[PDB]
């Protein structure tokens, strides 16, 4: 709300640090963390596994929010391919 000139203009080319991708990018990191949580899961106790699943679910929720906001920022009039 504070970051609005009039209502703001969505320029689709916009790369927040938390939106950075790659090996050091958030995406590979969260993928590896997902894998590690899964590897722990069979060896984890029941409540341990429960905390694992809620934590991982929240993380994936936030990542999907990131991608969806990216998509809504993107336009297609010339940049449908991006």
């Amino acid at each position: 709300s504070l970051y609005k000139n009039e209502s703001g203009i969505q320029e689709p080319e916009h790369v927040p640090w938390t939106a950075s991708s790659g090996t050091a990018g958030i995406r590979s990191v969260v993928t590896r963390q997902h894998g590690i949580i899964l590897k722990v899961y069979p060896q984890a106790d029941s409540g341990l596994r429960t905390i694992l699943i809620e934590q991982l679910a929240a993380l994936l929720n936030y990542l999907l929010d990131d991608y969806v906001t990216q998509l809504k920022s993107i336009d297609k009039l010339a940049n449908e391919e991006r």
């Binding site: 504070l2 970051y3 609005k4 000139n5 009039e6 703001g8 203009i9 320029e11 080319e13 916009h14 790369v15 927040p16 640090w17 938390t18």
Partner: protein, 163 residues
Amino acid sequence: AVVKDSRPDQIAHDDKTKHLKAAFLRYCRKDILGAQSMVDSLFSDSDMEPDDELDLAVNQISVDLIDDYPASDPRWAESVPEEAAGFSNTSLILLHQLEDKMKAHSFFVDFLHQVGLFSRLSTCQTKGMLVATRLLLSEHAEKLSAAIVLKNHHAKLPVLVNS
């Protein structure tokens, strides 16, 4: 009732940037009128179409405030490592520095809003990328929030988090 500040001049662009940061200083010292007068002096309408430089100056203000490595007072000149009063594994003090930098960013956004340059802000090239100024402020403040959060986790479980 009106006080106008200035800051060290390195370049012409750096000088106008430091004058804006000094208008911010007046804002921090509780002077809306002086900051507004300086903003009027540094920026006035002579046809309004986008230009990179206002965004460049605000962005370099933000980049400095975020990339700052303390050097100002002797403990910060010693934050620059020669510690005898420098950073030596303390949590509350650095939390306070993070608090004051959050104060600075928040007051800078408020200062820009109350002087009215926010609507004149635009999209600027950055590292080759065109970025919205307000979202750039969001990103930098979120980095600062992450630093605060790590500090909080240190304060909560020091040996664990510090190790």
